Amino acid sequence: EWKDRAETVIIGGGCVGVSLAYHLAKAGMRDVVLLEKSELTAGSTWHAAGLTTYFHPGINLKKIHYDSIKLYERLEEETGQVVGFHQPGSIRLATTPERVDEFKYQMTRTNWHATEQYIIEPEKIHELFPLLNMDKILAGLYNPGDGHIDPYSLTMALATGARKYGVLLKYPAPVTSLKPRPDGTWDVETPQGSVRANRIVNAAGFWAREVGKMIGLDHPLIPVQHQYVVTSTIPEVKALKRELPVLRDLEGSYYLRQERDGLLFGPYESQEKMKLQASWVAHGVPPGFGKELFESDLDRITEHVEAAMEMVPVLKKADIINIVNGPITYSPDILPMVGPHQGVRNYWVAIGFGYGIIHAGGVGKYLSDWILHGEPPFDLIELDPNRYGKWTTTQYTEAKARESYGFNNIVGYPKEERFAGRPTQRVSGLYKILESKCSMGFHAGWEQPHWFYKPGQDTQYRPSFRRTNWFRPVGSEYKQVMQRVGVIDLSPFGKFNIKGQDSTQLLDHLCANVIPKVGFTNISHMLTPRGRVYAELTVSHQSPGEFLLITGSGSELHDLRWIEEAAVRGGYDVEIRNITDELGVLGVAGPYARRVLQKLTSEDLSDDVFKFLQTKSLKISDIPVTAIRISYTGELGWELYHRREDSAALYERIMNAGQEEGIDNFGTYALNALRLEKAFRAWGSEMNCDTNPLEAGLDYFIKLNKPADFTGKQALKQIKAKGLKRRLVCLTLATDDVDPEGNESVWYKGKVIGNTTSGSYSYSIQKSLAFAYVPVELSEVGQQVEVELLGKNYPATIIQEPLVLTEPTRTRLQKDGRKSAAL
Numbered sequence: 001e002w003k004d005r006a007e008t009v010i011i012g013g014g015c016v017g018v019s020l021a022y023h024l025a026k027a028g029m030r031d032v033v034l035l036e037k038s039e040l041t042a043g044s045t046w047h048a049a050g051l052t053t054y055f056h057p058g059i060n061l062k063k064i065h066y067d068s069i070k071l072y073e074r075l076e077e078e079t080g081q082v083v084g085f086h087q088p089g090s091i092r093l094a095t096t097p098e099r100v101d102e103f104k105y106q107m108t109r110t111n112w113h114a115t116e117q118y119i120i121e122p123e124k125i126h127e128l129f130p131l132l133n134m135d136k137i138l139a140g141l142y143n144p145g146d147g148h149i150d151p152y153s154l155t156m157a158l159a160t161g162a163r164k165y166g167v168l169l170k171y172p173a174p175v176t177s178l179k180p181r182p183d184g185t186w187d188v189e190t191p192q193g194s195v196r197a198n199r200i201v202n203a204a205g206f207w208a209r210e211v212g213k214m215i216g217l218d219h220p221l222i223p224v225q226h227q228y229v230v231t232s233t234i235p236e237v238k239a240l241k242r243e244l245p246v247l248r249d250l251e252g253s254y255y256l257r258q259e260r261d262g263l264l265f266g267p268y269e270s271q272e273k274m275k276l277q278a279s280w281v282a283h284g285v286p287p288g289f290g291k292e293l294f295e296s297d298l299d300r301i302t303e304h305v306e307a308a309m310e311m312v313p314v315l316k317k318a319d320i321i322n323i324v325n326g327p328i329t330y331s332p333d334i335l336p337m338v339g340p341h342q343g344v345r346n347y348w349v350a351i352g353f354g355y356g357i358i359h360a361g362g363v364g365k366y367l368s369d370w371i372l373h374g375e376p377p378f379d380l381i382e383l384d385p386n387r388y389g390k391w392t393t394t395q396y397t398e399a400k401a402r403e404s405y406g407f408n409n410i411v412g413y414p415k416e417e418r419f420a421g422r423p424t425q426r427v428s429g430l431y432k433i434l435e436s437k438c439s440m441g442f443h444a445g446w447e448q449p450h451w452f453y454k455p456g457q458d459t460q461y462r463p464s465f466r467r468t469n470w471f472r473p474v475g476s477e478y479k480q481v482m483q484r485v486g487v488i489d490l491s492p493f494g495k496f497n498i499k500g501q502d503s504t505q506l507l508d509h510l511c512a513n514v515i516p517k518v519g520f521t522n523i524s525h526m527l528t529p530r531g532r533v534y535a536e537l538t539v540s541h542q543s544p545g546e547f548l549l550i551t552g553s554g555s556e557l558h559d560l561r562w563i564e565e566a567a568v569r570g571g572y573d574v575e576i577r578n579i580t581d582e583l584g585v586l587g588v589a590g591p592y593a594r595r596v597l598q599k600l601t602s603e604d605l606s607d608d609v610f611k612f613l614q615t616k617s618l619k620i621s622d623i624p625v626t627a628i629r630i631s632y633t634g635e636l637g638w639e640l641y642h643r644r645e646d647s648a649a650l651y652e653r654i655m656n657a658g659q660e661e662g663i664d665n666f667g668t669y670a671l672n673a674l675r676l677e678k679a680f681r682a683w684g685s686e687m688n689c690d691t692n693p694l695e696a697g698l699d700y701f702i703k704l705n706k707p708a709d710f711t712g713k714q715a716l717k718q719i720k721a722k723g724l725k726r727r728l729v730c731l732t733l734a735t736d737d738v739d740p741e742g743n744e745s746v747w748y749k750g751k752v753i754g755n756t757t758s759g760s761y762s763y764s765i766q767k768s769l770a771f772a773y774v775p776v777e778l779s780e781v782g783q784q785v786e787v788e789l790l791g792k793n794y795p796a797t798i799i800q801e802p803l804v805l806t807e808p809t810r811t812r813l814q815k816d817g818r819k820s821a822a823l
């Protein structure tokens with residue numbers, strides 16, 4: 001049976017594609033067609049070791065893991081197929097004090113999630129895994145009720161479920177070409193016939209890049225090699241009544257599990273030693289590859305084999321049955337690309353899975369929800385397909401994938417920095433000027449200063465779970481901005497120009513704030529139909545009907561995609577241009593900001609003439625700039641929008657003009673300190689698709705009664721009338737040597753009641769500041785709670801925000817006070 005017309009065509013029949021097909025149809029979508037080149041599981045899926053753990057070091061990916069595991073538990077009763085899901089639990093091993101710290105870090109990040117997770121003692125570990133060498137074990141990170149699954153049986157079960165709900169799965173039926181239509185639908189060609197599809201989804205494993213090239217896209221993926229070793233029966237293992245838990249020996253860099261009555265273990269060897277398929281990127285995947293392995297290579301993993309033999313002694317006497325060497329499809333940062341793709345209509349991807357077996361279930365549900373409802377069910381911008389860009393070259397991808405492979409089990413510190421592939425091409429002249437003067441941070445391809453070196457203080461990367469070498473420098477930079485004037489490179493912003501006949505009306509319906517009048521700027525949010533915060537933008541009305549929109553580097557294409565889809569879906573006639581890479585931006589902030597800049601322009605920068613949030617085009621020392629009086633520091637300041645080629649010159653002229661004022665640099669770490677004191681929310685931390693703007697405390701920017709029927713308007717009215725269950729608040733807390741950064745558990749009377757979203761040290765009050773979600777009944781100023789940082793609870797107090805009033809507020813207070821006193 002062939003369907004010539006489909007609602008959705010899924011390309012690829014690995015666990016990921018089949019999971020998506022199952023979910024879409026289970027949720028009621030008719031005419032789902034999956035096309036598979038040869039047979040189900042023919043890519044990476046069939047050879048996988050099948051490890052499926054509740055553990056993830058991130059945040060919302062925990063939900064993907066959780067959803068997969070709960071699904072895999074249900075599949076047998078649903079389909080009649082046994083999936084071979086072994087659930088003995090999983091233990092990550094710590095042998096160093098720093099790894100014990102990593103576990104404590106991970107615990108505070110996990111106690112506000114449903115994920116059941118514990119730090120356990122050597123005694124408990126030996127009881128669970130009695131064939132373990134306890135020599136050097138200090139602790140374990142334990143998730144009960146997870147383990148490993150048969151990837152073949154799992155896929156078959158999902159296929160059976162899919163067919164039950166009406167999915168047509170066709171194989172062999174390789175997609176050979178894909179052509180878009182003007183109405184946004186698709187023509188799909190296979191040797192078995194063609195399909196007209198309303199949408200297409202790429203889930204083609206290590207052919208994902210070949211599939212994307214069919215529609216003119218270059219997906220940044222590369223197949224890496226990975227090996228596990230399987231042993232024959234081991235008498236001691238056979239003799240066990242209970243199945244052994246899955247282990248990860250982190251110091252040894254391998255995982256290990258029971259396989260029948262023997263053992264299976266997989267190393268992640270070093271960057272220098274690991275192999276990857278650069279030839280497949282250069283020349284394509286070889287035709288006829290399929291259900292196939294690479295030649296085994298025991299030699300390159302020797303160190304980890306020897307490590308395993310000392311850690312689990314019985315491996316010394318065991319024989320090797322098999323060594324499985326097979327391809328895994330990696331993206332640069334190890335995480336998949338999951339979602340709708342910018343720049344092409346109705347094309348979705350689920351590609352680049354480093355851990356597809358654990359992810360397939362949860363991602364299938366997530367992506368099904370997004371397709372069916374028009375918004376992500378929860379925030380997973382860390383998987384966004386369009387976090388990558390033109391800077392993500394094949395060279396970059398190869399180096400970064402090699403790094404992500406080798407770093408599989410290194411200690412994960414906060415404020416982690418990785419250096420492979422850097423710097424990319426995404427830099428101005430300012431990079432060369434500043435690079436030796438500061439610690440450059442990586443953000444969506446850009447190099448952005450985090451903090452600036454001080455003479456006689458350590459300039460090295462020194463990652464830590466506690467305060468480290470940038471602590472004093474950051475305080476210096478805070479003082480610089482508060483007392484004098486600082487310059488910061490803000491060039492990484494996403495930047496879009498919107499004009500054309502319907503520009504105002506498009507923005508008016510996308511955005512929850514009013515649209516600013518010509519010559520003015522405001523802060524405005526793009527909400528989802530359910531009233532979630534998809535984006536926070538700064539909107540500048542530069543000339544009649546022509547706007548500049550500014551967003552964070554991490555949200556550039558995520559936000560552009562949403563805008564472009566709304567425009568075409570709504571029949572709006574506009575011109576949208578992504579000028580992100582055309583422009584640099586310098587922030588000049590602090591009480592001397594006006595004095596310095598006034599020396600360089602005929603434009604009147606006085607308080608009464610150049611008002612807060614005005615935007616004007618002018619010249620700074622003959623360099624054309626668009627200047628907005630605004631600053632995320634909350635001090636007096638202008639953001640100076642200019643051509644990238646002029647960045648180095650503009651910076652030089654400002655720094656020379658500010659010498660008398662003691663002008664100096666500041667970076668993003670100090671910026672975070674400053675914005676937190678002002679209680680400024682950050683998209684991605686305080687709000688995202690998980691939050692409505694009312695619980696986030698963004699109501700000042702929300703105009704529920706503006707005429708335009710903006711997206712999310714009705715949902716938000718309902719939310720407001722019903723009343724909030726939680727609220728974002730600001731906490732202060734004394735600590736000894738560690739500051740909150742967000743994602744930490746908040747406790748009250750022995751129970752977890754919320755979480756921090758961001759944090760800093762406040763140098764002005766000499767204690768820590770954090771934003772946090774807490775129940776509304778526990779959200780009053782003066783309320784006491786506790787924040788869990790590295791295995792210790794610190795008393796915290798809700799404060800009246802902001803800690804420090806902004807410059808415009810202070811200026812208004814003085815102006816009003818003088819007027820009143822003059823009576």
Ligand SMILES: *Cc1cc2c(cc1C)nc1c(=O)[nH]c(=O)nc-1n2C[C@H](O)[C@H](O)[C@H](O)COP(=O)(O)OP(=O)(O)OC[C@H]1O[C@@H](n2cnc3c(N)ncnc32)[C@H](O)[C@@H]1O
Nearest residue numbers: 012014016037043044045049051175205326355356357358
């Ligand atoms: C190699 C490996 C991988 C692995 C592992 C151990 C080894 C040695 N252990 C794992 C583990 O313990 N836990 C885990 O979660 N993952 C583990 N993996 C990784 C796993 O194998 C992969 O992440 C996963 O299999 C990826 O699945 P996905 O569905 O994304 O991709 P696929 O299985 O490669 O399937 C792609 C399908 O697409 C078909 N195809 C290709 N081209 C076309 C066209 N043109 N038209 C239609 N279909 C197409 C392929 O035939 C394939 O079936």
Ligand SMILES: Nc1nc2c(c(=O)[nH]1)N[C@@H](CNc1ccc(C(=O)N[C@@H](CCC(=O)O)C(=O)O)cc1)CN2
Nearest residue numbers: 523536537538550551552630631632639680681806
């Ligand atoms: N250009 C500009 N655009 C941006 C950012 C920026 O850094 N500058 N940063 C991103 C972060 N969001 C905000 C949020 C608040 C403020 C801010 O400045 N708040 C004033 C708003 C003034 C008002 O409207 O009353 C306040 O007092 O709350 C600035 C950027 C988004 N776009």
